Design an enzyme around this catalytic site. Structure first.
Site, mmCIF file in Angstrom:
data_model
loop_
_atom_site.group_PDB
_atom_site.id
_atom_site.type_symbol
_atom_site.label_atom_id
_atom_site.label_comp_id
_atom_site.label_asym_id
_atom_site.label_seq_id
_atom_site.Cartn_x
_atom_site.Cartn_y
_atom_site.Cartn_z
ATOM 1 C CG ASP A 4 -0.492 -0.021 2.498
ATOM 2 O OD1 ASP A 4 0.704 -0.326 2.678
ATOM 3 O OD2 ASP A 4 -1.308 0.250 3.467
ATOM 4 C CE1 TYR B 119 7.516 3.340 1.387
ATOM 5 C CE2 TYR B 119 7.375 4.681 -0.642
ATOM 6 C CZ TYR B 119 7.949 3.629 0.083
ATOM 7 O OH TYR B 119 8.931 2.863 -0.490
ATOM 8 C CG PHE C 296 8.824 0.275 -4.090
ATOM 9 C CD1 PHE C 296 9.064 -0.204 -2.788
ATOM 10 C CD2 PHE C 296 8.299 -0.583 -5.041
ATOM 11 C CE1 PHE C 296 8.784 -1.510 -2.414
ATOM 12 C CE2 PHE C 296 7.977 -1.950 -4.690
ATOM 13 C CZ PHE C 296 8.228 -2.411 -3.361
ATOM 14 C CG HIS D 180 9.818 -6.395 -0.090
ATOM 15 N ND1 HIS D 180 10.304 -5.268 0.552
ATOM 16 C CD2 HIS D 180 8.652 -6.031 -0.683
ATOM 17 C CE1 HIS D 180 9.461 -4.267 0.344
ATOM 18 N NE2 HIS D 180 8.450 -4.703 -0.401
#
Length: 216
Positions: free
Chosen positions: A59, A61, A72, A180
């Site tokens: 989701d 930030y 990102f 990740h």
């Protein structure tokens, strides 16, 4: 094929009225990120015809001035996320360039669709808009990209992103997968994974120009 047609098809297939009503309420009642005009910035900057690479996020930030509609990415003058710092460290080790710009609009313009799977969040509350409808929407986006494009790279960081392999036609598209970039997983296979050059090698092999991942 354009996003307007895809979005219309998705909203025809599924009933998003309760989701739309909720988001209306949330934006007028709470602090929701990103700014409403940026919820679809990934799509605005990467038209359907221009997609070369898809990178899935989680989701947005959830801090002030961070999210602006790309997975990102953060705005200038926002707290800089550790996962993005590790993405940039791997980029410098892989392609060679050290990025200074904290946002990824360059990548979006190059054809990188920076797709969070959930597109809104309340300030300071990670996952607060999980299971309101966004996952149905972004699954249908992933599937539309796989169905209507050929020779796209899907970069799937983390096990949850890798569950979307089910929506992707691996005979037409490239899948790059690893753990990740978060500090909690990056040292067990993200660093040294070279996703950016692997993506470019694929693109060149199918006659496409590479992504310029560096500063423009």
């Amino acid at each position: 094929m354009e996003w307007s047609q895809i979005f219309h098809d998705i909203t025809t297939k599924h009933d998003f009225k309760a989701m739309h009503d909720f988001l209306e309420k949330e934006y007028s009642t709470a602090i929701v990120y990103p700014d409403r005009e940026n919820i679809y910035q990934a799509f605005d900057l990467t038209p359907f015809e221009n997609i070369k690479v898809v990178i899935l996020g989680q989701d947005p930030y959830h801090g002030p001035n961070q999210a602006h509609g790309l997975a990102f990415s953060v705005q200038p003058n926002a707290k800089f996320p550790p996962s993005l710092r590790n993405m940039y460290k791997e980029l410098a080790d892989d392609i060679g360039c050290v990025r200074q710009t904290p946002h990824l609009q360059d990548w979006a313009r190059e054809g990188v669709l920076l797709l969070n799977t959930v597109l809104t969040v309340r300030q300071g509350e990670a996952n607060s808009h999980r299971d309101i409808g966004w996952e149905t929407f972004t699954d249908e986006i992933i599937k539309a990209v796989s169905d209507y494009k050929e020779h796209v790279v899907f970069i799937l960081w983390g096990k949850p992103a890798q569950q979307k392999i089910k929506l992707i036609d691996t005979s037409k598209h490239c899948i790059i997968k690893s753990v990740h970039p978060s500090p909690l997983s990056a040292y067990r296979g993200f660093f040294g994974s070279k996703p950016y050059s692997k993506a470019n090698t694929y693109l060149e092999s199918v006659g496409k120009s590479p992504i310029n991942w560096c500063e423009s």
